[PDB]
Amino acid sequence: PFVKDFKPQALGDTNLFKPIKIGNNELLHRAVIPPLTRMRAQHPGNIPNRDWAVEYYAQRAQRPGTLIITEGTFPSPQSGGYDNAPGIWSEEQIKEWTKIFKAIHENKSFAWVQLWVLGWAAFPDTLARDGLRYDSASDNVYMNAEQEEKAKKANNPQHSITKDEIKQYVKEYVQAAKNSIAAGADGVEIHSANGYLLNQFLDPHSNNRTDEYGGSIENRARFTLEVVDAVVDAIGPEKVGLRLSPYGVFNSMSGGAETGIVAQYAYVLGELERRAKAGKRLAFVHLVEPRVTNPFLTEGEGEYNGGSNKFAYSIWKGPIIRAGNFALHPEVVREEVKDPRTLIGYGRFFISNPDLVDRLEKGLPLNKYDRDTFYKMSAEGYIDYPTYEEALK
Numbered sequence: 028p029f030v031k032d033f034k035p036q037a038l039g040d041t042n043l044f045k046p047i048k049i050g051n052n053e054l055l056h057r058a059v060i061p062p063l064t065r066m067r068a069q070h071p072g073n074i075p076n077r078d079w080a081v082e083y084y085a086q087r088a089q090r091p092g093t094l095i096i097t098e099g100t101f102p103s104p105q106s107g108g109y110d111n112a113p114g115i116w117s118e119e120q121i122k123e124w125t126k127i128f129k130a131i132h133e134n135k136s137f138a139w140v141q142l143w144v145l146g147w148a149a150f151p152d153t154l155a156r157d158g159l160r161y162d163s164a165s166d167n168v169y170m171n172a173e174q175e176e177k178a179k180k181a182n183n184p185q186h187s188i189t190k191d192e193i194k195q196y197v198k199e200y201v202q203a204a205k206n207s208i209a210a211g212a213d214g215v216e217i218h219s220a221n222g223y224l225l226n227q228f229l230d231p232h233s234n235n236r237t238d239e240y241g242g243s244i245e246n247r248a249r250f251t252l253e254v255v256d257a258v259v260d261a262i263g264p265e266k267v268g269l270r271l272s273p274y275g276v277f278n279s280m281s282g283g284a285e286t287g288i289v290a291q292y293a294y295v296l297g298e299l300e301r302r303a304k305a306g307k308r309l310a311f312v313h314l315v316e317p318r319v320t321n322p323f324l325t326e327g328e329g330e331y332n333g334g335s336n337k338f339a340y341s342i343w344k345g346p347i348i349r350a351g352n353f354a355l356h357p358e359v360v361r362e363e364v365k366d367p368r369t370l371i372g373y374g375r376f377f378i379s380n381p382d383l384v385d386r387l388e389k390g391l392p393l394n395k396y397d398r399d400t401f402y403k404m405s406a407e408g409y410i411d412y413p414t415y416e417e418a419l420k
């Protein structure tokens with residue numbers, strides 16, 4: 028069951044096992060569950076899975092004081108376009124989320140909803156079935172030839188969203204954030220990473236707009252910062268986080284090939300620190316490491332060695348969550364958690380190790396993960412990974 032080419036290291040003696048306050052939540056350790064889409068939500072409805080989702084989250088909440096960031100969750104139908112990712116717009120969805128949050132809170136852990144808006148990564152034929160637009164920054168740059176063929180075959184060509192449609196998305200983020208908090212979530216994370224709609228605005232490849240949402244660093248950051256401002260004004264800065272992937276190439280983003288990419292992200296972080304100095308500091312910034320430029324590639328592939336997220340620490344002075352290939356690299360974690368405001372997100376190995384925090388504390392072998400069940404409508408590879416003690420039996 029265990030990864031064979033990995034020699035574990037106990038991290039119990041590091042800042043990974045020191046408490047830290049994040050927003051309203053007193054974490055007992057700094058191992059974070061990053062958002063992990065599992066495609067078990069039910070359709071019609073985009074309902075969090077009524078058989079399994081509670082169990083899945085409860086298992087991973089088992090170490091008290093754990094911050095859990097939910098899978099990407101759609102604020103509205105128009106935000107979506109994947110049938111088996113959950114939403115948080117409807118009473119049927121909110122009923123299931125409430126049970127999830129209850130389960131996480133019964134284990135004295137924390138639940139943060141990631142708010143996800145797809146843009147050009149949506150399936151345009153699924154959107155067309157539901158009478159929805161296929162939305163992005165650009166009126167003419169497609170994510171790839173496959174997306175362009177699907178959009179044209181469905182007569183659902185990519186729509187460059189207008190100012191009024193941007194404002195509607197901001198209102199949907201706000202309402203979805205309020206639904207999250209009312210249902211019991213500890214906070215929300217705004218997904219501005221991995222090539223989805225807000226990242227499509229930030230990135231100069233995807234954004235060739237000629238209005239105030241494109242054509243400059245400041246203009247490409249506008250949508251992301253309007254969402255952050257609206258959600259912070261609605262629910263409070265202590266209940267809001269942001270996720271960015273400066274070096275990501277997933278979903279046809281530029282990454283380090285774009286020489287202006289660090290300036291673009293530096294500007295976003297500077298504007299967050301400016302808000303913080305005005306009394307509105309976000310709970311955290313969540314950065315994907317250049318260790319993982321594409322989460323569809325195996326650990327050690329799609330590594331970008333040309334850049335680092337260290338710049339972020341000179342600009343943003345709040346908590347930073349870093350994710351990307353850390354589970355198999357405790358020697359890297361031991362160095363990175365020397366910084367007293369650094370938390371570590373563990374994605375793939377939290378899929379396969381519900382007791383990952385115990386295993387990092389004590390230096391236990393890790394369960395291998397089964398990539399074939401990352402996105403399958405199955406309990407198998409979802410709620411049937413064993414704890415270390417179960418694995419030894």
Ligand SMILES: Cc1cc2nc3c(=O)[nH]c(=O)nc-3n(C[C@H](O)[C@H](O)[C@H](O)COP(=O)(O)O)c2cc1C
Nearest residue numbers: 061062063064098099322350351352373374375401
């Ligand atoms: C199956 C899977 C689903 C993911 N879903 C999401 C998602 O919903 N939102 C998001 O921001 N990142 C998502 N990611 C990216 C992870 O949060 C993480 O940044 C990435 O897996 C790298 O960390 P790791 O090496 O520890 O797995 C996903 C990754 C995987 C493998």
